A paper describes a structure:
Acetylcholine (ACh) is an important neurotransmitter in the central and peripheral nervous system where it mediates fast excitatory neurotransmission by binding to nicotinic acetylcholine receptors (nAChRs). A nAChR ligand-binding domain homologue, the ACh binding protein (AChBP), has proven a uniquely well-suited system for the study of receptor-ligand interactions. AChBP forms a pentameric structure where the interfaces between the subunits provide an ACh binding pocket that is homologous to the binding pocket of nAChRs.
The ligand-protein interactions are characterized by contacts to an aromatic box formed primarily by residues on the principal side of the interface (residues Tyr89, Trp143, Tyr185 and Tyr192) but also by Trp53 on the complementary side. The backbone carbonyl oxygen atom of Trp143 interacts with the carbon adjacent to the ammonium group of ACh at a distance of 3.1 Å (3.0–3.2 Å), similar to a previous observation for carbamoylcholine. In addition to the water-mediated hydrogen bonds, Trp53 is positioned to interact with the trimethylammonium group of ACh with a distance of 4.9 Å (distance between trimethylammonium nitrogen of ACh and the centroid of the benzene part of the indole in the tryptophan side chain: 5.8 Å (5.4–6.1 Å)), i.e. within the 6 Å that has been used as a rough limit when identifying cation-π interactions. At four binding sites, a PEG400 molecule from the crystallization buffer is located within 4.5 Å of ACh. Apparently without affecting the binding mode of ACh in a direct manner, when these PEG400 molecules are present Trp53 adopts a conformation pointing deeper into the binding site (light blue and Figure 3C).
Residue numbers in the entry:
A (entry chain C): 1 to 155, 158 to 204
B (entry chain D): 1 to 156, 159 to 204
C (entry chain E), D (entry chain A): 1 to 155, 159 to 205
E (entry chain B): 1 to 155, 158 to 210
Write the structure that this text describes.
C-alpha cells in the first residue's frame, strides 16, 4: 500500500457525514487548547481576541489500514473525514482558521486535527491589569451530539509553551475541566470542556 | 438500520429544494429565540448587535424511517435538507452563523435546527440607560412563502437562561407574538414572529 | 404535477446561462427599489450606506407549466434560473445580500426575485442636514446586455417599508428610465435612475 | 444557431484552463483602465483606494461560430472561459469585483471582459493637495505568462466615467507598455503602466 | 502534445491530495520571501502587516511529460496540483492571497508557486524608529508533514529588489535560516525556514 492508494480509499469510502460510533458507545474526543496569542482585550465590553491551537483527537476505525509494508500515517483534507462539530459556547465571532485544513490519520484509525484559530470571546476580563490577572473561561462542546454519541475530555506542556513572547499579555495559568450539562431544550446531557485562562497585561 | 444507511438514504433522496407540505396544509414552523449576548448598542443610530440561538422546528415526513433496532436520531448537514427561508425583516447585516450547520432529525420526521447567530438590527434603543430599559423588536418570517405554505409560531425556560452574565446588558423581559401581514407588493398573507426584547445597561 | 415535479423539471432544464428572449425582442425587466434603511452618511466623502429591497420581475416562458390541479407558484433557488445581470453604476462596495436567495416563479413564466441588499454608494450627500435634504441618485442597469436584449423599466408609498428608527427620513423617491450610449460600445444600454430625497431627523 | 445552442457549445467545449495561443504567437491582450472614483487617499502611508473599470480584450478563436442567421454576440460567465491572469504589481488588497462576472463574446472569437474593481494600491501620493497633484502609477501584467505567451498593450476623455462627487479630480491619465526581466525567471514579462495624475478638489 | 493535452492530462491524473515523495525520501521544498511592502507597524502591540512574494519550488515527477515538439512549461490552477501545506507559525491573521492562484509547471516536473500575500504577524517591532531598526522574524514550515516527508530550505540576492519605494519603511537586511524542531506534542521533527527582516522607519538616518 502506498500513500496514493491509502488516500484514494479514504476519499472513496470515508463517510464525512457519519459519526464513527463503535458498539453505540460514544466517540471519545480529546480536546486541549494551546494559547498562541492574546491580541485585543476590552475590559469595558468584556471581550477578548485570542489565537489558539486547538488539538483534537479521536478514533475512526473505518479509516484504518494494514500498515505492514505501508506508510503509518497520511495527511488528509478534513472535507474527506468525519470531524466533530465542536463549538465554543461563548464565542461572539466565527472561528477564523489560520492554517491548512488537514488532519493527520494513523493506520490504526486515530485522527489528529490541530487547526490554529483566531476568535473573539465574551468572558470576564476584569482584573487584567492587576497582579492576579483576569480569568477568562471558554466552553467548548459538541453542538448537536449528546453525551452518549460524543464525549469530550481534556488531555501536557507549559501553558506558555507556544505562547508568543511579544504579546502585551502573559499567561499565569491554564486549567481544563470537563462538564456534563442538561439544557431545557433537550432530554439528553451534553459534554463540554471548560478551559480557564488566567492572564494579565505585562 | 444503522446511521450510515439512514444518512445515505437522506442524502440520496431528501430533496432540499422542496417544501414538505402535507395534503396542501402549510408546514408549521416553530421559532423561538434565546438571547445569548447583546454586544453593541448605539442609541444615536438605533442599532443593536445581538447573539442569539434561533430554535427552529418543523416536520418533514419524507425524512422518516422505521426506528426499530435503529437510531432514533441523526445529525444531518443542512445542505441535505429542506430548511425554511426565515429572514429578520429589520436586520441590517447578514446573519453570521457561529456554529456548525447541522440539523437534528428524528425518526418520525421532526427536524430541529438551532444555529447560533450574530446579527445587527435596526430597532428602538431609546431608554437603554434607564430603569425601564429599551424595547427592541425583531420580526422573523418566511421570506418567499405565504401563510398557506408556511406558518410560523412561537414556542415557550427562563429568559436569561442562556444569556451571558458578562454582557454590559441585562434582560428584563422577552415576549413572542405572532403576526399575519399582507403587503402592497403581493396578494397573499405572510406570517411572522415578533420577538420583543426588553433590556437595559447594567 | 406537484411541487417536487415542477422543481425537478426546472432544475433539469431551466438554463441559467441563457437570456430568455422571445422573437428577438428584448427581455422586459421591471425594477423598483424600496428603501428600508439609511445607515451611514458621510457628507465629506459623499458616501452613503443603504439597505433596500430590490424588486425585480421578468418573464421566462421556458419555466411555464400547466397549472391545472397543480401549484400556481414555486420558490426556486436563483442558481437554477436565469437572472438579469443588474449592476448599480455608482456602487463602491459589492452588494451584500441579506436574505435567502430564492425567486418566486409563477406557472405562466413570471419570475419575482426580491432580495434585500446592503450597499455603499457614491453620490451627492450635500444638504442632508437641511430642510430640503440631500438628493442621492442610484443608477441600475444591465451590465453586459444592451437595449435590444434587455430593457429595464421602473414599476405604493415611499416610506412604506422604511425603518422608523433610522436617523434619516425619506422626503421623496422618484424613478426615471434612461438609454445611454458609452464611448466604449456602439450599442445603447438601459438603466433606471432612482432619486432618493432624504434628510437628517430632528 | 440560437443563444441556447451557442452557450451550450461554449460550456461543453470549455477549456477555461487553456491559453488560446495560435501558431505559438502570444495572445494579444488589450488593457485600459477607466477610473470611476478615488475614495481614500493617505499621504502619510502612500496608499490610495480606487474604483476602476478594467477593459480587457483578446481573441479566442476556439469560441468562434458561424453567425449567419445567428446572434452576433453572447454574454458568458467567465468561469466558462479562459481569462488572462492579470495582476496589479503594487496592489495591497485583493481586487473586489463590484459587477456581474460576465464576458461578452463575439462570433469571430473576440472576448470583452470589463469588470468594475475596487482596490487599494501603494503608490506616490505626495502632492495630492497641490496644483500639480500627485502622480500614482499602477502596473498591471500577466502574473505567470511571459511575453511569448501573453503580450499586454494599452489602448475617450480621462474623466469620462469619473464620478463628479469624488473629493478628487483627474488632471491626466497616461498608459505606457513595459517588458521586464525579473531575477526569478529568464524571460520577460509584459505590463501596462497606468499613470494617474490627480489632486484634491478645492 | 500541445498545451490543451498537457493540461487535460494533469487535470485527469495528478492527485492534489498526494505528497509526491520519491523513494520515501522527503520532498525538498525551496522557500524564499521577497518583501514588497510593510504597511502597518505597531510597536506597542508588536504586530506588523507585511506584503511579500512567497517563492515556492519543488519537484513532482508525476507531472512530467516529454517536451519534444511540445511546450516546455504550462500554468496550472493550484487546485489541480499537490501544494505544500506551509504555514507561518507567528501569523495572527489568515494569509490574504492577492494574485491569481496559478503555479508554473516545467516538463521535468518542477513546480514554481509564487503567490503575493498580505499577512499580519506577531514579532519584535522594538527599535523600528531607531538607526538599528527592528528585527522581525517569520517562521514558515510544513504544518502537518515532518522532516522525513517534507524538508524546507531557503534558496545571495538583493533584499530590497522588489520592495516598494513608497513604503514608510526601508529594509536594512534580510537573512534566511533553516531549523529542525521537535515539539512536545509530537515525536517527529519539523523543518522550517526562519526569515529575519531588519527594517526601520524612513527618516531615522539623517546626517545633516
Ligand atoms: C440540535 C441542537 O442544536 O442541540 C443543541 C445542544 N446544545 C445545547 C449543546 C447546543
Ligand atoms: C418573492 C418575495 O420576496 O416575496 C416577499 C414576501 N415578503 C414581503 C415577506 C418578503
Ligand atoms: C461587456 C460590458 O461590460 O459592456 C459594458 C456596458 N456598460 C457600459 C453598460 C457597462
Ligand atoms: C510563476 C510566477 O509567478 O512567475 C512570476 C512572474 N512575475 C514576476 C511577472 C510575477
Ligand atoms: C497534525 C499537526 O498539526 O501536527 C503539527 C505539527 N506542527 C507543530 C508543525 C504544527
Amino acid at each position: 500500500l502506498d500513500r496514493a492508494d491509502i488516500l484514494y480509499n479514504i476519499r472513496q469510502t470515508s463517510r464525512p457525514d457519519v459519526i464513527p460510533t463503535q458498539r453505540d458507545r460514544p466517540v471519545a474526543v480529546s480536546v486541549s487548547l494551546k494559547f498562541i496569542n492574546i491580541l485585543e482585550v476590552n475590559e469595558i465590553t468584556n471581550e477578548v481576541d485570542v489565537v489558539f491551537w486547538q488539538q483534537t483527537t479521536w478514533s475512526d476505525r473505518t479509516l484504518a489500514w494494514n500498515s505492514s509494508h505501508s506508510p503509518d500515517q497520511v495527511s488528509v483534507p478534513i472535507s474527506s473525514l468525519w470531524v466533530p462539530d465542536l463549538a465554543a459556547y461563548n464565542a461572539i465571532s466565527k472561528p477564523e482558521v489560520l492554517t491548512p485544513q488537514l488532519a493527520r490519520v494513523v493506520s490504526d484509525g486515530e485522527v489528529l486535527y490541530m487547526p490554529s484559530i483566531r476568535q473573539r470571546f465574551s468572558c470576564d476580563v476584569s482584573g487584567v491589569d492587576t497582579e492576579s490577572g483576569a480569568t477568562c473561561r471558554i466552553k467548548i462542546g459538541s453542538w448537536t451530539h449528546h453525551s452518549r454519541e460524543i464525549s469530550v475530555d481534556p488531555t501536557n506542556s507549559d501553558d506558555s509553551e507556544y505562547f508568543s513572547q511579544y504579546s502585551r499579555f502573559e499567561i499565569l495559568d491554564v486549567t481544563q475541566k470537563k462538564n456534563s450539562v442538561t439544557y431545557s431544550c433537550c432530554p439528553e446531557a451534553y459534554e463540554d470542556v471548560e478551559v480557564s485562562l488566567n492572564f494579565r497585561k505585562k
